[PDB]
């Protein structure tokens, strides 16, 4: 199976409003960088679609070392996901689950590889996750894409 190191991050200048992701996926040495803003979404959407976008551009099936900082995207894969399944995507006041659309999108990427999750704390020491936060941050300042599942 391919190999393949991806990076992400994803962030909002103001939270909510623009934001952007940026992820890196790099296979046998080469890169290839993803990296596009939104008009109006919040920082955990960002920093969940930018894991999603990484993953969506594997065209075969792979073996991911996936690096983020995000605790969201982190407490959502370790904690959180199993159980919303469980329950048909809902919480215990039978509201869908925040960002469900999202966290779906992502379910069905992570199925279709074998992933190892490198949670990552502080750009220190990491220099490609402190790269996808420069590219988030600089995609929020042009945004050109709708958010769509967003919802206040």
Request: glycine share 12%; net charge negative.
């Given at each position: 199976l391919k190999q393949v190191?991806?990076?992400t991050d994803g962030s909002c200048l103001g939270?909510?409003?623009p934001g952007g992701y940026g992820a890196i996926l790099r296979y046998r040495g080469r890169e290839k960088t993803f990296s596009?803003?939104?008009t109006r979404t919040t920082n955990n959407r960002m920093?969940?679609?930018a894991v999603i976008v990484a993953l969506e551009a594997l065209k075969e099936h792979c073996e991911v070392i996936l690096s983020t900082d995000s605790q969201y995207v982190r407490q959502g894969i370790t904690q959180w996901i199993h159980?919303?399944?469980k329950r048909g995507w809902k919480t215990a006041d039978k509201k869908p689950v925040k960002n469900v659309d999202l966290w779906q999108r992502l379910d069905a990427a992570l199925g279709q590889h074998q992933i190892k999750w490198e949670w990552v704390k502080g750009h220190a020491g990491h220099p490609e996750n402190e790269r996808c936060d420069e590219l988030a941050r600089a995609?929020?300042?042009n945004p050109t894409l709708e958010d769509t599942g967003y919802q206040v």
């Open positions: 190191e991806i990076f939270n909510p409003g596009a803003g939104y920093e969940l679609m159980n919303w399944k995609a929020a300042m």
